[PDB]
Design a protein around this ligand. Structure first.
Ligand SMILES: [Mg+2]
Length: 49
RNA sequence: AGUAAAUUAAGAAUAGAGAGCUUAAUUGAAUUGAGCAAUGAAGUACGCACACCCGUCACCCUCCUCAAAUUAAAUUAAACUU
């Protein structure tokens, strides 16, 4: 049993910036984050700050 | 331990009727042993006495024995003289 995280791929946007996506589940909530390799720390949740 | 707590929603059943019941969700803890030891099991030893006691005195009836003398009921060797 490999207790080692399964690294996600690194996709590319139309602009060409690198980004990865992953799902998360806590209680009944489910989230789908889309981290970008380069940014200024701007997190937008459901299109809101 | 997503527990307690708190806050919500729905459902069953009714024509209507619960502060009840069932189910779902949200927020979300504190604590978990230097005893003073309660049960249930395991092991361990011992305690108990039955198969779930004696003593005295209480009324009851019976045989038994001795027992004071009394009253008797009755018994028994027979010898001896000419
Ligand atoms: Mg009602």
């Amino acid at each position: 049993q490999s207790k080692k995280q399964l690294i996600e791929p690194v996709q590319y946007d139309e602009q060409g910036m690198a980004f990865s996506t992953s799902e998360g589940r806590r209680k009944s909530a489910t989230a789908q984050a889309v981290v970008y390799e380069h940014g200024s720390g701007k997190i937008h949740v459901n299109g809101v700050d």
